[PDB]
């Protein structure tokens, strides 16, 4: 039983695991070391009668590849994910009255030219995501962007200088990012996954260039993206030291970071800004747009805007 263990059991239902560990690695051993890390952290809030804080770096912007997403704006995939996160907080509040809060710590601004989404696109996605939070009626979901960093106030509307403030204060050199990735199984698994997102972002259906050159480009840029994500994470550890650290990547079981799913999906690395919501057998699942078209998915529109597919 135990209030802290009940919170954790609620999260464990939606945990992202490394696909490589699902077939034969022992999930019970993973759970044991998760309990050691997460339980006193959750228990800290409960002992103080305070609401449980979660931090989640996520929802940066849609993939720039028109072959992967329906449009540049948040859609049914974001909508159901944000609604899920809100209901997770409500379920916790059922047994723990002070409840829980999830702050979405958007990393859209942290990347810059590394993922190749312009700052105007990021700002539009940011604004549209907040608006989506309001219309689903989510009250336990907050947003924290790079420009909300109180210490960086003067540079709030100068995006490149914001990025340089994050880098200057919180980034490790690329040589050290690389050394860390090469130090563990999971570091290399991360590096491979981030390379794949970048490569697939560049594989536009209209792309007619070299695939090999695209892969080599992605491999180099993946170090930078990790550097920024880790810098952002480090910044947020000082902003919100006690918060339970959620992630949209699978995480080592000994890590402070806890990977969490937001919609049913086969791919543990897949997130709503890199895919599409799919209605199939009267349930919503998240899939890659190319995969659903191959299965002969039908486009659904709501109002005048592309929304999701159906099977």
Number of other residues whose CB lies within 10 A of the CB of residue 74: 25
Find, among 150, 294, 299, the residue nearest to 235 by Cα.
Answer: 150
Number of other residues whose CB lies within 10 A of the CB of residue 175: 9
154-171: b (≥16 Cβ within 10 Å) or e: ebeeebeebbebbeeebb
Contact (Cβ atoms closer than 8 angstroms) between residue 297 and residue 284: no
Contact (Cβ atoms closer than 8 angstroms) between residue 191 and residue 227: no
Structure token digits, residue 293: 């078209």
Between CA 150 and CA 142 the distance in angstroms is 16
How distant, in Å, are the alpha carbons of 6, 71, 145, 281 from that of 2? 6, 44, 34, 37
Q: Nearest 5°: phi and psi at 260?
A: -135, 140
Residue linked to tokens 């918060």:
243
* Dihedral, 68, 71, 74, 78 alpha carbons, nearest 10: -30
Cα–Cα–Cα angle for 84, 86, 90, rounded to 5 degrees? 110
Query: Per CATH, which fold does 275-311 belong to?
Result: Wheat Germ Agglutinin (Isolectin 2); domain 1 (3.30.60)
Burial group, residue 241, by CB count within 10 angstroms (0-12, 13-18, 19+): exposed
Question: What is the DSSP track for the chain?
Answer: --HHHHHHHHHHTTB---HHHHTTS-HHHHHHHHHHHHHHHHHHHHHTTPPEEEEE-------S-TTTSS-SS--HHHHHHHHHHHHHHHHHHHHSTT-EEEEE---HHHHGGGTT--HHHHHHHHHHHHHHHHHHT-SSEEE--GGG-GGGGGGTT-HHHHHHHHHHHHPPPHHHHHHHHTTSHHHHHHHHHHHHHHHHHH--TT--S-HHHHHHHHHHHHHHHHHHHHHHHHHHHHHSSSSEEEESS---TTSSEEEB-SS--S-TT--GGGSEEEE-SSSEEEE-HHHHHHTT-EEEEETTEEEEEE-
Find, among 5, 17, 14, the residue nearest to 41 by Cα.
Answer: 5
Domain boundaries, the chain: 1-274, 275-311
């Amino acid at each position: 039983d135990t209030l802290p263990a009940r919170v954790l059991k609620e999260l464990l239902l939606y945990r992202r695991r490394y696909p490589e560990h699902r077939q034969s690695a022992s999930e019970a051993d993973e759970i044991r070391r998760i309990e050691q890390v997460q339980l006193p952290r959750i228990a800290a809030f409960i002992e103080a009668g305070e609401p449980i804080e979660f931090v989640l770096p996520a929802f940066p912007a849609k993939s720039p590849n028109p072959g992967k997403v329906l449009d540049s704006r948040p859609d049914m995939a974001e909508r159901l994910s944000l609604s899920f996160l809100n209901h997770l907080c409500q379920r916790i509040q059922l047994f723990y009255a002070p409840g829980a809060k999830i702050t979405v710590c958007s990393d859209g601004r942290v990347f810059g030219d590394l993922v190749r989404i312009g700052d105007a696109h990021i700002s539009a996605y940011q604004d549209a995501l907040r608006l989506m939070i309001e219309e689903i009626g989510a009250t336990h979901i907050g947003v924290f962007n790079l420009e909300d960093v109180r210490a960086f106030e003067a540079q709030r509307d100068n995006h490149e200088q914001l990025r340089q403030l994050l880098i200057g204060g919180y980034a490790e050199p690329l040589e050290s990012i690389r050394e860390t990735l090469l130090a563990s199984e999971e570091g290399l698994l991360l590096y491979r996954a981030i390379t794949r997102f970048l490569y697939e972002d560049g594989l536009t259906p209209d792309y007619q260039g070299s695939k090999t050159a695209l892969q080599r480009d992605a491999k180099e840029r993946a170090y930078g993206v990790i550097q920024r994500s880790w810098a952002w994470g480090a910044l947020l550890a000082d902003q919100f030291p006690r918060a339970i650290r959620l992630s949209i990547h699978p995480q080592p079981a000994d890590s402070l970071k806890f990977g969490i799913h937001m919609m049913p999906t086969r791919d543990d690395w897949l997130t709503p800004w890199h895919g599409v919501a799919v209605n199939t057998e009267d349930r919503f699942v998240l899939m890659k747009r190319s995969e659903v078209l191959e299965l002969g998915g039908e486009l659904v529109q709501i109002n005048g805007q592309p929304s999701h597919y159906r099977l």
